[PDB]
Structure formats: structure tokens, C-alpha cells
Amino acid sequence: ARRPARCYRYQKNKPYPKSRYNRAVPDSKIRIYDLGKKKATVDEFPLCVHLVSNELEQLSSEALEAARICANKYMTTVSGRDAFHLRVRVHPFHVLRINKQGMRGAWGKPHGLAARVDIGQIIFSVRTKDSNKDVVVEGLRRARYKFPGQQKIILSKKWGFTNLDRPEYLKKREAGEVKDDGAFVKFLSKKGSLENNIREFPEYFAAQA
């Protein structure tokens, strides 16, 4: 057993997901996808760090869980559990097949589950404070070893996971059109109703600081 990712590496087949035509597939081994202080705010975590791909390939659900475990262990041993929020941004939806006389009836049974990653696609995202840039970089360097192919750390200059580069987001915050939700934020748009906009963003519609 345990055929290599070198023979399940490239994207050769069409996406073959779990559906009503394909049942009795084994479960993925990755079950948790967000990690660290996942209830924190983008207020608390300004800097984003992205592990991105350079190859059009397939990532095993095993490679995802192993990279997540090693990265997690490194950041908790160094910087503690609450200093980061790590989210894996690929979900294994590909049922890989195994054949297991001759080539007659060669259509194979389900064997796995894979994340088809494109060039320039986020694999790992870590949001953290400005002082933990080093430790999140070396944790994602450990992640780059359990993951096949070539990957890059890009210092994402978006405030947290969201959008909206840091001066733009600072301007939005000091304008007051940003409301703190659970692990995310809500934005004021100039297209909704006046009454519900009033009752959901009082600070923009007041003379507050």
C-alpha cells in the first residue's frame, strides 16, 4: 500500500468528486482546517503570510494534514498557541483511484482524496502580529518540505485574512464603517436601507471619534 505522490502528482484526470455516482469512498485524514486563536479579530492580527504554489499539481490530504501538524507544532512550541491564526485554503475533493486479469475492467476503486492546486493559489494562510513574522516564516518553511513541488512565502499586506490593504483598512476603521463580527468584520455599503444601516453602524452616522 501507500503509493507515492510521485504517481499521484500531476492533474491528469477530470475532477472526480464524491457524488451520487461515486459512493463508498474513504474519508480524508484532514478534519480541522483553522487553528490557533481562531476566535481572534483582524483587529488583533494585522499581518498576513501566504504559502502559495508555483506548480499545477495535486496535493494529498495526507500532505495537507502532515504539513498542518508540523507547522502547528512549531508555532505553538515557539510563539505560543494564541499568537497566530492558521487557515488551510485547499480542500481535498478529488477521489484518486487505484487499480489493484490484465487491463480488462481496469476502472479502479477509490483510494484517496486530493487538493487540485493551481499556479498562484493559496495553500496556507497565517495571520499574526508584526513581531511574529520570523516564526510564521519558518513554520511555513517546514510546511514547504512536507508539500511537494515549489512554493513561496509572500508577505501579504492585507489587514488580516480579509481584503483591503493596510492604509485602506485603517481609513475604513477610523471612518467607522467596519463592525467587529466573530473572527471577521462587516462593512457599511451605501446601497442598503437607511433604517437598518442606522441600527447596524451607529458610529458612522454619529459624530463620534
Partner: protein, 294 residues
């Protein structure tokens, strides 16, 4: 009531046709009515459209065109009191007189008046307008009831019998005229004729005048105002029929306070729309009113 419908529902929602949505046409019935045999290429299928409001009977001859339906002739129960019927504008007698009026009006307009005189000896008997040999075939129209039920003894079938007795070749059967006893499976000429000259309204008048005075007065204050006795109803309906046979010409109203005055003075009461600057001004006024965390 927290039953507001979602954006996905409203996006996937297909609205019906306009007339279906306001519930005025059956497009199934209308398609089967107005679809023409394609080997005739130009012949419009003419519809004797009969409609009943609470105080009027509308009876038109309509042909179908790509730009919209066009009319050839119209007759109105509120134009019937010009002829002879000042009371009972939505009875079965006014329906028959309106069908007779629309038939005579459309044949007079078409120039088919010297032939196809109709009956002139109305007797409550079922017959079809036979084609005159060596001459034009009778004008063929089809009854458009619309949405009302096709029950036996209906005013729309009265307008049907009126157009048939006028001279329009409308195909019809006799199993929907009043007096068609299905046990005997024939027609009743006396009952049909009595109801032609309004025997039902008459016998209601004498039954009320015998039994209940206050009720009779309440339902027929107009009849007592005109001093029309209970047995001249056939007389006035007959005289209406030969007035229809005499002058089937559309006379418009006197049309006082003409069309430009109607457009100008009658309604400045429709409240006009605003523009972008006014809408923004109202928005800013509402921001100023709702300013603060109150």
C-alpha cells in the same frame, strides 16, 4: 410577519404574462382562438368578445394583429337606453339586444345589410344562419366568453343567440340555451321566448307585488318612478328590437369639455416623480433627522 421572500427566490422568479398576472385572459384559450389555419395566410379570426361588468355589458368584434388586437364594431349596454331599455341594463334581455345590436352594426358596417335580415319574427327557436345561395357567405365570428363558466342559461349565450338571430354565423349548439331539459334533451321554445321578452323579470315583479310591497319597492323604485307596469315589459323589449333593426348606427356622446381640457384640468392630482437631486436631498434630510445614537 417574517415571511419576506429571499433575494435568490426573487431572482429565480419568473413573472407571468401581464394579462395573466392581472388575471384577465386565459392564454391557452386565447391561443386556440386566434391561431389561424396557415394556408389562409391573412384571414383574421374574428371574435365576438362578450364581457360582463356589474353595471354594463361589453360586446365587441375583435381581430388579432401582431401590433395588438383591433376592433371592428362595439356595442354597449349603457348605449341601449338610447334605444329602449332605461332599466335592466345587465339582464338577459339587454344581453340579447346587445348581441342583436352588435350583429346589425357589424353587418351594416360591412355592407351585408340588404341580405341576412336575421329573423324579425323572434320566437325562441334554435336555428343557424343558412348561407344564401348565389351570394356572400354569412360573416363568421367565434364566441369569446373569456373566463366565466359555460353554464346553461347565461347572458353570454344570450348575446350569442342575439348575434345568431341578428345574422352573424356563429357556430353553436342548443344545449346551453335556457329550457334545455337534459332529461328530455330538447329545447323549450315557449320558455326561451318568454325569457326573450323578459318573462322572468315580469313574474318576479308580479310575485313581489302580490307578496311583499316593501321589497318590491326597494328593488324596483325605478320601475315605479317610470310607472312601467308589470306587463308592458314585452312591449318595451319588442319596441327596442325594432329600434335596433331600424338604426344600428353608432352615435357618439356630445363630448363636452374636450380632450385637451380633459388632459389638462381633470388631473393635476397625479403626484409627479422626483429626480436624483431631490432623492439625494431627501436622503440627506433623513440622515440629519436620524443623526445620533437615539
Amino acid at each position: 410577519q417574517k415571511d419576506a421572500k429571499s433575494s435568490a427566490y426573487s431572482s429565480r422568479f419568473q413573472t407571468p404574462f401581464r394579462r395573466r398576472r392581472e388575471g384577465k385572459t386565459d392564454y391557452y384559450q386565447r391561443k386556440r382562438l386566434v391561431t389561424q389555419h396557415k394556408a389562409k395566410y391573412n384571414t383574421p379570426k374574428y371574435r365576438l368578445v362578450v364581457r360582463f361588468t356589474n353595471k354594463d355589458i361589453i360586446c365587441q368584434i375583435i381581430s388579432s394583429t401582431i401590433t395588438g388586437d383591433v376592433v371592428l364594431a362595439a356595442a354597449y349596454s349603457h348605449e341601449l337606453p338610447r334605444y329602449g331599455i332605461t332599466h335592466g341594463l345587465t339582464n338577459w334581455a339587454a344581453a340579447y339586444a346587445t348581441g342583436l345590436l352588435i350583429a346589425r352594426r357589424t353587418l351594416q358596417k360591412l355592407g351585408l345589410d340588404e341580405t341576412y335580415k336575421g329573423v324579425e319574427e323572434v320566437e325562441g327557436e334554435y336555428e343557424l344562419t343558412e348561407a344564401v345561395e348565389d351570394g356572400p357567405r354569412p360573416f363568421k365570428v367565434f364566441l369569446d366568453i373569456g373566463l366565466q363558466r359555460t353554464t346553461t342559461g347565461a347572458r353570454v349565450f344570450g348575446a350569442l343567440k342575439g348575434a345568431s338571430d341578428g345574422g352573424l354565423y356563429v357556430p353553436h349548439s342548443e344545449n346551453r340555451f335556457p329550457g334545455w331539459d337534459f332529461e328530455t334533451e330538447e329545447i323549450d321554445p315557449e320558455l326561451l321566448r318568454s325569457y326573450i321578452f323578459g318573462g322572468h323579470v315580469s313574474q318576479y315583479m308580479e310575485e313581489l307585488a302580490d307578496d311583499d310591497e316593501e321589497r318590491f319597492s326597494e328593488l324596483f323604485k325605478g320601475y315605479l318612478a317610470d310607472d312601467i307596469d308589470a306587463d308592458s315589459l314585452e312591449d318595451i323589449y319588442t319596441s327596442a328590437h325594432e329600434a335596433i333593426r331600424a338604426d344600428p348606427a353608432f352615435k357618439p356622446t356630445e363630448k363636452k369639455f374636450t380632450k385637451e381640457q380633459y388632459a389638462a384640468e381633470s388631473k393635476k392630482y397625479r403626484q409627479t416623480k422626483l429626480s436624483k437631486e431631490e432623492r439625494a436631498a431627501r436622503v440627506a434630510a433623513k440622515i440629519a433627522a436620524l443623526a445620533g445614537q437615539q
